[PDB]
Symmetry: C5
Subunit: 391 residues, 5 copies
Amino acid sequence: EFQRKLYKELVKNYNPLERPVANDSQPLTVYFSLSLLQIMDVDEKNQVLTTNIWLQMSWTDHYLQWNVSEYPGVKTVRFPDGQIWKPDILLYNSADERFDATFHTNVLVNSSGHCQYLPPGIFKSSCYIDVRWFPFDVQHCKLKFGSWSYGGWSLDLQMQEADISGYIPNGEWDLVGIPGKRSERFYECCKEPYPDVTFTVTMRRRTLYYGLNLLIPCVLISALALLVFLLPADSGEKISLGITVLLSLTVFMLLVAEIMPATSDSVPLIAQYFASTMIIVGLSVVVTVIVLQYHHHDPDGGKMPKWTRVILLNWCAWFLPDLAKILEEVRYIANRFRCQDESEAVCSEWKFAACVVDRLCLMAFSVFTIICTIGILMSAPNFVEAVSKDF
Amino acid sequence: EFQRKLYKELVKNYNPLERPVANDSQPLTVYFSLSLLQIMDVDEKNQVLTTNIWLQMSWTDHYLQWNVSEYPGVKTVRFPDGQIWKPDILLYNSADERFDATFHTNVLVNSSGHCQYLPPGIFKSSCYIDVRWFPFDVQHCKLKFGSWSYGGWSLDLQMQEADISGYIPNGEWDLVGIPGKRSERFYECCKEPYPDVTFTVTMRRRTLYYGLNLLIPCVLISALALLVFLLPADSGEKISLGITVLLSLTVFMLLVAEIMPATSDSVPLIAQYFASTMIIVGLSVVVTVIVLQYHHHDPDGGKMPKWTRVILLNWCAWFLPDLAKILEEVRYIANRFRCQDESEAVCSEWKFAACVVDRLCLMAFSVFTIICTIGILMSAPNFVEAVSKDF
Amino acid sequence: EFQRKLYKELVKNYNPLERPVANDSQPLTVYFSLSLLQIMDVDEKNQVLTTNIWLQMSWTDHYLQWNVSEYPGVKTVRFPDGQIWKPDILLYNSADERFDATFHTNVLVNSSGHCQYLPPGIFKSSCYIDVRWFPFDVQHCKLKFGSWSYGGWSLDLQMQEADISGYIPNGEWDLVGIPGKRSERFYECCKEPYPDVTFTVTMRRRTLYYGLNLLIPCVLISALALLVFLLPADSGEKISLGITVLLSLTVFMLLVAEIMPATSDSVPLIAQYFASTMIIVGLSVVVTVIVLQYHHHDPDGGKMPKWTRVILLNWCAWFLPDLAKILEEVRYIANRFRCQDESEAVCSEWKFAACVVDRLCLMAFSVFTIICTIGILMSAPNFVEAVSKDF
Amino acid sequence: EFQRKLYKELVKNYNPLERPVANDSQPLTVYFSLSLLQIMDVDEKNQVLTTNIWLQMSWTDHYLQWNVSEYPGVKTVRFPDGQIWKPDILLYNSADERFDATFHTNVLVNSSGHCQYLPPGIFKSSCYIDVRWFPFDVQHCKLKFGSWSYGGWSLDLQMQEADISGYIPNGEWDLVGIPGKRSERFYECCKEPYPDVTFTVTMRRRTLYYGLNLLIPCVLISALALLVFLLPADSGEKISLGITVLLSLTVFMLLVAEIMPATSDSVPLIAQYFASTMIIVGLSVVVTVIVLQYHHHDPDGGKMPKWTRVILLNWCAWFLPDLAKILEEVRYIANRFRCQDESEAVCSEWKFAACVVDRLCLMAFSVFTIICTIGILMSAPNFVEAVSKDF
Amino acid sequence: EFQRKLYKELVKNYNPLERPVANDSQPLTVYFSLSLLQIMDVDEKNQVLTTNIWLQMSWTDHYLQWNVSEYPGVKTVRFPDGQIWKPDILLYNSADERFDATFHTNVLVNSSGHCQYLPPGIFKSSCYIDVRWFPFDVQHCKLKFGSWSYGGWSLDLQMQEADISGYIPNGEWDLVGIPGKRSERFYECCKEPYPDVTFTVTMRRRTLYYGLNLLIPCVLISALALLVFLLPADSGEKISLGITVLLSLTVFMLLVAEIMPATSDSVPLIAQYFASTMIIVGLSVVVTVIVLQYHHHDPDGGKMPKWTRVILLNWCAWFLPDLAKILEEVRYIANRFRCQDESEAVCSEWKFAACVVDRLCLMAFSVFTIICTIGILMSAPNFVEAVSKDF
Ligand SMILES: *[C@@H]1O[C@H](CO)[C@@H](O[C@@H]2O[C@H](CO)[C@@H](O)[C@H](O)[C@H]2NC(C)=O)[C@H](O)[C@H]1NC(C)=O
Ligand SMILES: *[C@@H]1O[C@H](CO)[C@@H](O[C@@H]2O[C@H](CO)[C@@H](O)[C@H](O)[C@H]2NC(C)=O)[C@H](O)[C@H]1NC(C)=O
Ligand SMILES: *[C@@H]1O[C@H](CO)[C@@H](O[C@@H]2O[C@H](CO)[C@@H](O)[C@H](O)[C@H]2NC(C)=O)[C@H](O)[C@H]1NC(C)=O
Ligand SMILES: [Ca+2]
Ligand SMILES: [Ca+2]
Ligand SMILES: [Ca+2]
Ligand SMILES: [Ca+2]
Ligand SMILES: [Ca+2]
């Protein structure tokens, strides 16, 4: 009975289009804050960040002042979108295709004339994502808020501390904080200045999934490709293994390339690792070809180099009537056998050379693989941190 | 003729913006309920739940009271969205990009002044999905409803029992119930408190599809990889089989990783199983390399260890003129043959050692595989339940 | 000149919110029909049906009655959405995220007061799809229409026969008919009853695509895997073939699982077929291992079982001075040769055993494959029908 | 100053809901045309066509007539959507989920009372796509326009020639023309007739991409699978090659099936080609098995057929004291050698038979492949055309 | 207090529908500019460009002129969408499905009557993308702006220089500039002319990602396929390697075809490279078949060509009582041995021929591969530029 009379009274001569103030040349103060319920999702490929937040706008209005004595028991009044005045605050860097995801909600007012506006939102923003240290990476995403048609001479934004109290953990990221900052900028459009409020979300990725799904299989594959050397040449399965491994590695590179963005600013870590692995395996294939070349060789058809063989041997050693016709034919067959034996002995020497080559290159490749893996993974700053918590 | 007159009369001096009550300081009561037609879908990857429900809001209005004697035969009247007052009840935890999926429908009123509002909706909600026990998993999804600009001093929500009578079975989940709960919370925004109504859907996954599509092939693949040992070394297909199996297993891991979320909170069961399988197969490859190492070996080039061979043998046994020239040459060839025979015998000893190694490691790996499979699958609490119904 | 005057006259004292009738307590009659232009699409995975239809609502209005003599030459008048009264008829079981796809169009009226409303629509509906007999399957999809805030005491729905005259063939389904049915239900919300109109679309899938793309390759793959037996053990390609076939079959199972829903209500046919095929091929691999076990075997190292060999043989047969030194050495070498020959003969016996095993298991597996394929495909009721038309 | 007065004057007593005419019983004439800027896209799978066009509606209005002498210098006036009357012309066969993609724009008027309305649009339409001759295919897509609530007695549509002057080439299709046609139809809804305007777009696909990406690899794969015959049986790589080729072909069939619709109306060309290729390769595998069967064969274990061998040979030929003990033992070993030689000779005969089988079946399969490829590709009507322009 | 009075005064007799000018026949001037914040994304497949920009419209209005002395301290006033007049400027070539992505914002005015309108937007445009030189490619995308219902006689567009000051680098493209141009066109719709403003964005792709992900593996694969020749025929892994490589190359072609559009206008570079690689590898397979044909060959079964062998040899050379019975049998066995030796020697000659063929074709294919790679990659104009910056 009093609420109705008050509602009649307030909009007697109102006009939403005016900035409500006692002095027309004195700027108005608006307190702007953010509240962050959830980190909905992150997309590296498209470079977008989806978040669920509540804005918080507060400002005092002169006209909507009423006395509590004449109107009893009524403390708070509400007004919808178009009936009163609201600041047209919205996101500068959006990717929503509608550009304003705010669900227009009510406005609360109390006798002094204060006014609150907490519009929720599922906001999409255009971060700049970097993968120089993927998966051991930390990301900085800035949300930039400000007014559009109102400037410093006519509006004045002041920042309050954000709110992470209701924050719900995501399960794929860790939140340090969302520090805020105010600035005044000078756009090449207009005379008067324009302020802005920037909140810088810091996130750290939890690496258990990407550590138990990518890295461990990669190291195991490298181990398997190292294990090829020991397989003796007699078994014909010496090179099918390596080629199958390379095909598997190619599949793996497809997988990882799908889940990463195409940024040419800086080369990523995981790409360095994959490149090293493929080069190592290719050199393994080449060495294996050399080995099978030495192993199969006709002693009578060819000969042997000197310097190579002697150096190889040194390195290995340090590391490790009618009766007359009868006689004639028997002599012949025995000589045949002796020649065969000598040929076989030379072949055996060839084979020993092949085995020593195998062993030497095996040790070399094991050392190279171990060193490269360790160095590449140590290169990441956050590694020491990420392994202490996630594991 | 009377309907028209009533409609004229009721909106003579109405204003939608007022909370309709006899006493302005006395709070209003609103009865809120839910009805659940269908569980539209669930998405583990994005962690979202899509449901089809009918809200149920009921409250009494003082102004829309009319006498039935003067207006005859008219019992119920209807009012659209903006003409009368409605509570702005909406979902707190939404993922719709429009944030309010409710299809604004009519409002029904009867002479006492009671009012009903049943707006339907395809609601999306941000559950927290867990896969610690996938596929034998049970999920708890909470839907949180409440008002936005109205508090306890001005509105009072009371909960009625939900409705699963019209529920349509999904074919991929089982519904236990949707218990509801009321609470009062204190947000770091405002002085007065705010209530909320939370419904906790419990779902259990039916495992026939995921049991006949994933687990059975995995066990069969492990069996095939066990069957490699028995393949004798003479056939060159001893290691191509295992490597092909590993490539297939990698493909399988791709498949499963696509259909699972990237949560680092806790390691999942199926990942434990896959890790065990890949480690087992890798050790199988290594053992096979060792076997082919022993089998192919030059007796004259090398020798044999003692402790290893004797222990191996024990374990196996418990488990299982010119005429003179003629004579000279004949003597020579016979001695050659005897030496060849001795070499062959030593080679045979090597081969027997290889076979016994094969058998021993085969039994060891069979035991390990069986034990690990059984233990990993027993680890799931719900297993005993899920196998009784689904199968 | 007369149209304008009529339009002025009709809305002189109108109000869209009243149910237009002579008697306020007498219910109104509404004739509701459907017309079906196209079956836009079907999605098994999400269980949705997308259709293009035209509603048909007809009802008489008392107020919009005018005399044709005073207003000459004007027969039909039109009214847009909010100016007159329309029944809020909409789909009960929708999946559109907007929940009302109807494109609000005009309303036609003629002097007696009759009114037509044909709003088009691309409607999405939540069918219950079943794949127990895929691809030889028939589907029943129900569209449920009714009013929301109007009941029997205040509205009365009557059904007319649907319209398939304009129906456009799809190319992937066949339409039998869309029988309609009326019912009155009692929802656990309200006192008065509520009617509903349900149209049951029946569809049959045309199988040429899925018969020439899935089944034929499957049978050919089974044939190829049968052809492995005949490959003699000497060629080392006896088991690579089968394993490659199994990998291909796994790929095929991936393909089919992608295009099918995850319903645990009932096991599907195609899954039965695939399971049978994989089990058959696995037993083939095992048999091949056994064969290569017998073929490669040292006669001197081991011996032979009796019962197995004799039974195998029976089944096959039914189915199919210095001179003294010279003499000594010659004697020795000849004895050596004789022993070698005997060993070779025993080896030949082993090999013959392997070949007979091959043949027997080949026939067994051919019989099993043929019988299972024929039985599984006959199991489908619609098969006899689907092969008469589609092929 | 005059524009304002004119705008006041015109809407003094207007009502958008009336059909504007001098005579109420005389029908109105509307000139309807289309203009086609771009062929946005085509989707075979869903059977949809996305286009960018400008409608062109023209009609004369009686009320908006003004004298140019009293109002000077003002020639054209503009009116937005709801202020004046417009015909509710829209697409009959749409797939947009909003059903009317027209961007409501202004309306232009000139003193005589003529009125223009050119609303742009990105229209989606439900073509009927056919792939009987893919990729050498020509497509007919019909766009059907007409009014909804206005008939012949009240509206009269007349068609003007379309406009392809601004047409922008797509790069994946070629446009012949868009002939238009008018018709009057009799829907089973209503008494009065209803006209319609149908434009029939004709498109021809440019085949360079699909000719250099699909066909050429297919023919090369068939060539490689032909090249298997020449590989001699001694090299164990005779059947791995063919099976790998078959796996590749399966992958290719997956690729092509993804990019084609599931229409069972008629079998497509590319499917015929793939079926022929797979059957050819399967018979190749079978022949290879036969060859390896003959090549490996124990002469003593078995014998040889007569008719087959003789016919094969003909076709090939047309196409292409103590001393006594010493003597005894020597006799024995020599007889042994002679028997071995005879066995080897019989084996050689077997091998020659295998080689001749290889050659004969090779020529047969080459002839079959060439003939089938040529015939299948000639079968397409448009082939001769498509190869003259695209290449 | 003055703002309110001014707002009352200005809209006393306003009408948004009039073009505001002193003279009704004199055209109005509008200054149009663009500002470019970000290049959101590019899609080659669908041929679309997504950008984030700010329009800039400026024009003077006669009615909204007020004196600053009477109204003190108020300099700028604001007006929302429908209250005042705005030019309906929008994109001609759009792909948004809503066709106008502009977020309608306020309008700023100052006493002289000047008016600004800066509506932001995430605009989608239909470029024409070309891949003739992918990845070393430069793209020209034109954005075409203009008015719809207003012409030269009634509106006059003038262009200001664009703004790239706030431009944010993308990380996948480089921006040269966005030159603008004005034109007057004559559409086949209307009498009066219509202007337009076209901005031509130039972009250059940064190639590090596509250079380290595609090209390097391709060259390594070609190297591996070259390395097959050196593998001696004795090892049975001579052709499995090449076929596995071809399968990998097919997978790679799938990958690249997915990420490229299906434009038949002109053949692309990367396709030329892939075609060359596959042809080279196929000829490699054929050569390998020839080699294995010569290597395995029965000397007694056949003979040798003359011209081929002699030319091959020249090119290689330039490049690089009872006792009588005893005697009889001994004679026999010795003759047997001699014949065997001669056969073996002829076989050795065959094998040497095979090896020389291997070497010659190896050098030929290495030369061909090197030349083709170098020539194909040099063919790109931008290559020399792109390698200087990106690397
Ligand atoms: C109306 O709302 C304002 C906004 O909070 C209230 O003003 C606050 O009052 C408390 C009480 O001492 C102060 O601590 C705060 O500093 C005040 N706000 C600000 C921004 O300074 C006010 O009390 C409310 N009630 C009335 C009747 O005005
Ligand atoms: C108003 O618009 C109409 C529509 O075009 C104009 O009428 C055309 O005038 C030309 C000039 O001779 C004729 O060739 C056309 O045939 C006319 N249109 C039609 C549909 O017949 C008219 O000139 C314009 N101006 C005025 C003042 O009416
Ligand atoms: C209102 O806005 C106009 C638009 O800029 C202002 O006019 C500009 O004034 C400066 C000052 O000398 C000139 O350099 C510009 O050339 C003017 N604009 C144009 C388009 O020529 C004007 O000063 C503003 N204030 C008032 C009171 O009119
Ligand atoms: Ca992510
Ligand atoms: Ca699921
Ligand atoms: Ca389907
Ligand atoms: Ca296409
Ligand atoms: Ca791109």
